[PDB]
A paper describes a structure:
Transthyretin (TTR) is a plasma and cerebrospinal fluid (CSF) protein synthesized by the liver, choroid plexus, eye and pancreas. TTR is the main transporter of T4 hormone in CSF and the primary carrier of retinol (Vitamin A) binding protein in blood plasma. TTR is a homo tetramer with a total mass of 55 kDa composed of 127 amino acids in each subunit. The inner β-sheets of the dimer–dimer (AB–A′B′) interface form two T4BP cavities referred to as sites AA′ and BB′, respectively.
Residue numbers in the entry:
A (entry chain A), D (entry chain A): 10 to 125
B (entry chain B), C (entry chain B): 10 to 124
Amino acid sequence: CPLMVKVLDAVRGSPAINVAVHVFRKAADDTWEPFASGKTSESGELHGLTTEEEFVEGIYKVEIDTKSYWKALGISPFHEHAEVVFTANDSGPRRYTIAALLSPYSYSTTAVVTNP
Amino acid sequence: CPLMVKVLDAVRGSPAINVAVHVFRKAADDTWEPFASGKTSESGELHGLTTEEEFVEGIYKVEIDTKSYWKALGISPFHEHAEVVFTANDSGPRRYTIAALLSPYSYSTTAVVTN
Amino acid sequence: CPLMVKVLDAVRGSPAINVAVHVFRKAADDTWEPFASGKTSESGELHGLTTEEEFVEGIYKVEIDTKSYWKALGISPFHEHAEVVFTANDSGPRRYTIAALLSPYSYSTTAVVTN
Amino acid sequence: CPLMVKVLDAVRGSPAINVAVHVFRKAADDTWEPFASGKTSESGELHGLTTEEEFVEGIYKVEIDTKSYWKALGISPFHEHAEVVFTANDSGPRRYTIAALLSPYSYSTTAVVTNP
Ligand code: NA
Ligand code: NA
Ligand code: NA
Ligand code: NA
C-alpha cells in the first residue's frame, strides 16, 4: 500500500487511536471525490487505504478528523479537522506516509515520501 | 479586527513574506464562500481581514498558499496549500491568531485565542 | 534588545504566562554561565533580557521551565525543561526571537532572525 | 530496548540518516555522565542504545546532533543540537520513543511512552 497515515497525541505521549481519516481525490470537474477512508489502529497507524493500481496521479486530500477524536475523549478542541492536500505520483509511483501530531489547539503534519 | 494570520519560514528562520491567504466561511449549503483575503506583510502578518461585526459565529477556513511561496524561493514543496478549519465561538470577547510554521514537507499550525 | 523569547501553550491555545526562562552563555571552559533570566508576561513574551553591547558572538542556551508551567496547571508533563542552544553570529544587524510551542509530551522551537 | 530515537527531515520529506545521538544520565554529583550513543540508520531510527537492566530510573538527556547533520549536507543551520531532557522509569520500567522533526531554523520533538 502506497499511502499510510500515522497520528500521535501530544497530550498523552501516545498513538492517537481510533482517529477517522477520509481521503478524497480531485475529479476532472474540480470536485473532491471520495477515494478511501479508515481509522487509526492501536498503534496510531492506518494501513490498507489503497493499492498501487488504484492510487493514480492526482491531487489528494487527507482529512484527519481531529475534532471527533478530541470530542470522543471528552475534550473541546479548536480545529474541525486537519486537511493535508498534495499532488501524488506525478513523477511515477511513490510511497507516502502522512504523519500528524495532535494537540487541542495545534497540530503538525509531515510527509515522508519514498521511491520503491 | 478579531482575526490575524501569522506565517513563519522554518528553512530561513524568517517571516514568510508575500504569502497569499484566503479566508472562507461555510455557507448553509456546505460550500465555502469567499470571506476575506490578502498577502502577508514584511513581518509575516496579515492584519485587517475582518471586523467584529462581520466575523459572526460559524465555520471558517484559512487557506495559505504555501506552494507558491516555496516555488518563488526556488524550492520544491510537498503540499498544495495549508488549510486551517475551525469554528468561531462567541464566549465572551475573543481575538484569534492563526499561526503557521512552514517547511517544504511539513507545517504546523496553532491557534492563539485571547481576550 | 537583540534577544526575545516567546512561549505558547498548544493545549489551551494561549500565551504561556509566567514561565521561567534562563539564558546562559558558554564560557571558555565549556561551562554554562548565567547570562539573563525572567518570566514570560501575559502575552507569553520576555523582553529586555540583554543589550546589543552585552550580546556578543558566542554559544547561548535558553532554558524554558516547562515542567513547572504544566504542574501549575495541574497537568503531568514529560520534559524537565525545553533547551534551545545556538550560536549568535554578527553578520550585519540582527534580532533573534526564540519561539517555543508547548504540549505536555512535545514541544517545537523556531528561531526568527531579522534585520 | 526501552529507548529508541527517530529523526525526520522536514526539508526533504525523508528520514534523517546518519544523525549522531548522545545520551547522558544525571549522576549523584549533578553532572551529566555519558550513558550511550549511536547514529540513525537509513530509516532515521536508532535502536539498541541500552537494555532494560541498564536503563534505570534517572534524569536523561538525549542530544541530537542537528548542526553536524545539516553541516554534513552542506547547510548552515541555527541550532547547535536538540536536547531532550526527561525523568525516566520513575513509576517502573517504560519504553520511550523520542522523535524529532528537523528544519534548518526549527525543530520539534515528541515522546511516545508505553508500558510493556
Ligand atoms: Na508527470
Ligand atoms: Na501566491
Ligand atoms: Na517556574
Ligand atoms: Na518512583
